[PDB]
Amino acid sequence: GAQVSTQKTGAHETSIIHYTNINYYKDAASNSANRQDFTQDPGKFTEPMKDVMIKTLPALN
Amino acid sequence: GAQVSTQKTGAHETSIIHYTNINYYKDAASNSANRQDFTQDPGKFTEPMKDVMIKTLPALN
Amino acid sequence: CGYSDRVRSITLGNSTITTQECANVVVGYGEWPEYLSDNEATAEDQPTQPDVATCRFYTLDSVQWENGSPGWWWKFPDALRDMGLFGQNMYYHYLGRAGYTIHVQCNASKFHQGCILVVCVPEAEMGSAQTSGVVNYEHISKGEIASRFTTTTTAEDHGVQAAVWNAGMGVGVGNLTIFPHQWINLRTNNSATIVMPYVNSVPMDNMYRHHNFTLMIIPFVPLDFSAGASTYVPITVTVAPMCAEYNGLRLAGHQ
Amino acid sequence: CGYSDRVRSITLGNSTITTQECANVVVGYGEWPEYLSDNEATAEDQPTQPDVATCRFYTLDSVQWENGSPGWWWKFPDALRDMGLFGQNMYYHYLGRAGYTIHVQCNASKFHQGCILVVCVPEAEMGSAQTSGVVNYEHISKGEIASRFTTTTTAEDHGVQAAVWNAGMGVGVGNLTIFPHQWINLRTNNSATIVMPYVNSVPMDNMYRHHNFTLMIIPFVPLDFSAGASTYVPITVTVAPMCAEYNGLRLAGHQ
Amino acid sequence: AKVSSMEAYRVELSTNTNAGTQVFGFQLNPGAESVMNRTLMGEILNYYAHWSGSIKITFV
Amino acid sequence: GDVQNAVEGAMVRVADTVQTSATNSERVPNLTAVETGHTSQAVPGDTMQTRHVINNHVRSESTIENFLARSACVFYLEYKTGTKEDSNSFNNWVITTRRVAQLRRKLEMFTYLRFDMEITVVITSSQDQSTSQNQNAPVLTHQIMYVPPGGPIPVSVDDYSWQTSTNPSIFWTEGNAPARMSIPFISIGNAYSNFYDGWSHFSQAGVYGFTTLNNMGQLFFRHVNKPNPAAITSVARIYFKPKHVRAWVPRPPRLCPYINSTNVNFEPKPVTEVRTNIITT
Amino acid sequence: EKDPYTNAGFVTCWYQTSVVSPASNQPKCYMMCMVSACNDFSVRMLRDTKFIEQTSFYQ
């Protein structure tokens, strides 16, 4: 039971190349590093507010 | 997810032999050299003209 | 038809050059210059595009072709630094981008002979006369005044090696033809027109530091004529910027 | 809402002025500046419009308001002649047209009092101190340095008559209010913004010969404060050109 | 003296100063300019050889 | 399509010759005007009667990829097994491609060049003569460390720097197949620039030439083992292979010999070799 | 790293008018400057820092 996934490739002038991975061990610890996952969320640090602040309005009014 | 493609072979007296390739790495950089691609276009160098020149007609007329 | 292909009229801005003897027009590498797209932008600020005010034929200085003379070169965009509002925009902006129409003019009567190569070499990095030395600015360009080649190997301190046959950059002169070129062979045409588009490895660049290309005019067959048939024949190089756009505005200066 | 009408942000080009105390913004005669139409064109050549490069806030020199000082004036477009690429385009072009956002800045604490009239007078032709004499250029403008009014009737030879109360042009100062004006009365606002559109009797004009309008700043109630509460309060005038377009390109010069 | 104290962070303004006087100046070049060298942004930057982006300086 | 997809190909073959017959026409296909800057498109059938020939030749060793993609030696560096007191116990090399003559000439045929690269390194060791040169020693491991621009630099064979917490390193024991890495594209521009005509300073000064753009870090080499009772000298030969190449703007080949690796300086040479006479059999 | 090829220009601050105060109040005051990276920012080519070093193992 192989898994297929897309390789990192840059942009091009105005695509998809796959690679194959199979796990050979019984413990999830033995698996390769998870280097693909670029999700983020600055929210928790950059705006830890209770009341929402609208950018265009004055901060204190 | 294997890929199949045709090997270089010469002409014959009056065919197709395949090989198999699978990528094992997560970065497109690690892939084998792209040695098959024989496309070309002399146009840009051999005739960098604005007005088309017809071979059979005199160059200046 | 009533057309002939020996007459051509190029009008750009408020400047028109006509010519009644020419052989076609070479569009550099098949591509016509045009404005930067939004897929290749890097700068975030809104570009200025002065259109008609900065696109028009700037007639640079004209040198005299003589029997013994060995050749001339000018470096662009550096040469245009005193030309009107092009110069000014270039002086007040960090980044600039533009293509150019190079039009070399020369003429003679039927009883003259001689043939000049007109070639636009992109990225011409040049040697140094002293091979332990290092060239400096003043021997690389004189602005809009032509830098002369020499036919004698020896040269001054901070001289550039400029022996004709090695093109001043260590390659056989006879192969320069690989770059966009024409020939003004006196008998047929009497002008060259090369529409050079912007070629660089980066979308816009600083106009002072970088020199995009060098216009080399090399006489392969010497000027000759029989006695008492005029002795002065100049070569005038006229160049027009196309699609010039500038990003990054700040105070005037070099440093 | 969350809005207040005391905060305003004007962004034009790559220049933003913010102000947190102001009273509205006066659009001169109800009309917002805009480009010349094809029904009012006279010139045949294609105009250049430098957009972002020549529209942006040019901060001119700032004079100090003192208790005894009588007032200041500047003449536009003449004042902007050394300001960046506006200056350059104006120098290389016979005809120019543009509107302007005049933004006068001043501020003080609560324990100061004083009130200045800020008025844009179109076509202010001025007298001469000697009434048989004739004024000359140097006493009409000092470029971007403010011309001072005087409170003493006598003045030098080729002096302009500049006794405050007659506005330097023979009309009672109290009636100047008929032209687009605001007041910076220290206690309420601390800035004035007049968006002056192009007003002339002819579609475009030469930027050197003609002076479209004069910005007069006259203190009607003198600056006063109680001891030891700061003594230096400057007045900074910042102006931005809008919709500037130029016809008729030729070599730089005045004559 | 001021660099080993709290003084370092506070830029001194003064009343009765002529208009058009420079308060301060330094060339921008984070992660190699002393001013931004050891700030949060700076510290992150010094683990990399290439940066790109826009910076925002909030004056309070 | 994509030049990093190597299983996708294309095929084309060299043009055939179509049979022609005698003519007495009013069209000239072999008169042209060189001045134009236009290369003539004459083909043999225009000035001879030719037979019909089919060509199955294919240009296939003149593709840019096939031309450039062979591993060239770029530099070799030498270092002894020593202590901290020695200043030859480790060594380093500033990365450049201009040291060797052969590979340099190949690259310089294109103004702009964009590629990924396979770096292979062959390390060979030799016993230095000494009184105790019949001393026994076990196998030696070597460490190759890449230091990107503006990182810490070793001052000795043994200091903190060698910890390599985010610097790529290869530990290679002798008697194994040569160490090999692949490196992606790594410029800050959109292509490597083999020629830069310009100055490092806006006042038209400083450094002239390509030097200004190149900056790629350095390779530090050392032995991992503690010293034996006699020195062993090692010499590492570095091999580079450009794969997935794309090239823009062809230039004339070099004619004059190189002199320096920081500039294009040359002294003028004859155009071509002399021959006996203008008519020669 | 500082390099002559790439520079990022000069940030300067100037008095647009002046600081004005009332009667009994301090003449000198202070401003403070925050710095951060905008929402489009990125970094490449991971490498060691130069702000820490040792000469031996810590104990």
Ligand SMILES: CCCCCCCCCCCCCCCC(=O)O
């Ligand atoms: C142990 C890790 C080693 C990593 C090595 C990184 C090597 C970077 C190589 C850069 C090659 C640059 C080629 C430049 C070509 C040119 O313009 O002449």
